[PDB]
Design a protein around this ligand. Structure first.
Ligand code: HEM
Ligand code: HEM
Ligand code: HEM
Ligand code: HEM
Lengths: 141, 146, 141, 146
């Protein structure tokens, strides 16, 4: 459960991401693919090569959804209904993978937002990605 | 694979009593029913809409038997699972694109199936031996992912 | 979330447990100690020998809590609050261990309720233990 | 390890630029803050009631340095982490009762600290080699649990 401090921390940090969220989305995917190659099993139809437009494109999509999540930090379940649906009934990504992308996203934020990636902020973003993960896998069964 | 001789004897003694045809169908069907997301690989199997539709599906039964068949062979080479499973690992990775977490879910379901079937005979220590085995097989099946 | 069907399944299977709950609790523990030795780090103070009275004692406590969650299946967060606090603040059991115990409880029920441990029931019991684990870990951070 | 000469050189080369004193203290402290339950082993350290109290706690900082120290020396036996951490594995199991899952949490925290520190330098390929090392270390440390 995201505390008020957490919501603030998250909104702040994501605030700094700004026009780079798409690039950060793409970078987190690339880090995921290389560090946890089992994640590639869900993207057989993608060109997973460095700088691939499919990856860039997808990176944007993910980034955008996170934005929307930050914006509705108070009503995630509702802001992400459709996405929860898609993942539960179409994509059927195994739940273990959400933790992998979440980690690659922290690593990416850390590498890009040094001043802002304080221990307290690190803690909030983690919780946040965890909540988002919970929401996305809530209708699996 | 830290199977003590006694752990290996125990795996082998029980495996002697198994009807792979039967266990295979049960294990695979139960996987599709407990973790419905795993159904993503079988949209050509037809109706998997309810437990009965899954459990009785002739295609699930036949596939389960195939899977357990390869597993049984694995049990005769506890020594070299990686080698034993190499071409299958490659196939699952490169052709089938099966997330290896699926191998661990099936192992757990299989353990519950053996417990279901053997009752009291599936003692704490026998379970512990089989836990090492399903993990070793999952690991061997995942060795060729890259 | 547990569906009406799930609820019925759980009350039914647990119903059959009846008076053996305690013994099945102890057995699940032993299975866990034997299959996942890392879980032992939480009971350095216990006699983990076979037929340990401490294990017996502990299995009963776990079984009572599960019986309590079944009795209050529509209000588990409240029925387990106390236990949720204890685990979050005092015991501080890493979350990954709940899945291990859950698994060993499922093996135990399977081993004892052959006629009831149907695919449908298996699925409901797994969702149930996952829900109990979620409650127990909800106040961790 | 299953490190590529190229992967070995990346690890090795970045490590050379690391201040173990600072990275050790930061890694351990972030651990106690992000995953509060890990504080169960450091009650004697004092007040860990806030990020600030954790990050400022000298006992935390000094333990952090001891841990990264040991880690650092393990980077010199990358081809036998098992043997390098055998005694440490026993200690952790038999004396400290630390669940090996903590080894994995720290590893991930370590990677976030390196990314934090090195920005640009900590590229996807470089993170990949470090993920392999932290997993390797965690495995080595957990090897003697029974
Ligand atoms: C942080 C949590 C995640 C978020 C917010 C997220 C968000 C999204 C979004 C916005 C889409 C695009 C929907 C559309 O095409 O209209 C999508 C699709 C997809 N996601 Fe998720 N995702 C997450 C986690 C994951 C993970 C961990 C994986 C697998 C490792 C995954 C696999 C996929 C795949 C395979 C697609 C479809 C790709 C395509 O065919 O274009 N997702 N996700
Ligand atoms: C013990 C673990 C497993 C073993 C030993 C195993 C073995 C096999 C074998 C022998 C085949 C046939 C190979 C061929 O067509 O040349 C196969 C195919 C297949 N396996 Fe696996 N399998 C295992 C686990 C799984 C799991 C858990 C899943 C999915 C959740 C899976 C998905 C598939 C699929 C989708 C096919 C192809 C079916 C078709 O013909 O369309 N496997 N497996
Ligand atoms: C669904 C799962 C669980 C349930 C229902 C449960 C329930 C309980 C209960 C009722 C108690 C006794 C509290 C009292 O003194 O009144 C307890 C204590 C304890 N539990 Fe949990 N627990 C669960 C999972 C776990 C797991 C997975 C672990 C670690 C592997 C664990 C470790 C402990 C420890 C170390 C104690 C204290 C025992 C003592 O010192 O007597 N618990 N639990
Ligand atoms: C990178 C993995 C780790 C390494 C290389 C490592 C190494 C060490 C070393 C070298 C010591 C010194 C103790 C002695 O020689 O008597 C130590 C002690 C200890 N470690 Fe670990 N450690 C690791 C992870 C952890 C984690 C993640 C925790 C808990 C969150 C932990 C808890 C402890 C505790 C409680 C002590 C005892 C300190 C004292 O005596 O106050 N360790 N560790």
């Amino acid at each position: 459960v995201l505390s008020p401090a957490d919501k603030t921390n998250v909104k702040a940090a994501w605030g700094k991401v700004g026009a780079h969220a798409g690039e950060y989305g793409a970078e987190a995917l690339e880090r995921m693919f290389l560090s946890f190659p089992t994640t590639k099993t869900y993207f057989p139809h993608f060109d997973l090569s460095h700088g691939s437009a499919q990856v860039k494109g997808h990176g944007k999509k993910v980034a955008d959804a996170l934005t929307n999540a930050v914006a509705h930090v108070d009503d995630m379940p509702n802001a992400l209904s459709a996405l929860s649906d898609l993942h539960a009934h179409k994509l059927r990504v195994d739940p273990v993978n959400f933790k992998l992308l979440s980690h690659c996203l922290l690593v990416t934020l850390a590498a890009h937002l040094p001043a802002e990636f304080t221990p307290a902020v690190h803690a909030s973003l983690d919780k946040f990605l965890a909540s988002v993960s919970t929401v996305l896998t809530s209708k699996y069964r | 694979m830290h199977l003590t001789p006694e752990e290996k004897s125990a795996v082998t003694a029980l495996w002697g009593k198994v009807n792979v045809d039967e266990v295979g169908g049960e294990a695979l069907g139960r996987l599709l029913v407990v973790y419905p997301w795993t159904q993503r690989f079988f949209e050509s199997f037809g109706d998997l809409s309810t437990p009965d539709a899954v459990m009785g599906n002739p295609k699930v039964k036949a596939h389960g038997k195939k899977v357990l068949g390869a597993f049984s062979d694995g049990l005769a080479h506890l020594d070299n699972l990686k080698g034993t499973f190499a071409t299958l690992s490659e196939l699952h990775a490169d052709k089938l694109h099966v997330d290896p977490e699926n191998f661990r879910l099936l192992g757990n379901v299989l353990v519950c199936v053996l417990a279901h079937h053997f009752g009291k005979e599936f003692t704490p220590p026998v379970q512990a031996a089989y836990q090492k085995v399903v993990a070793g097989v999952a690991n061997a099946l995942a060795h060729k992912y890259h």
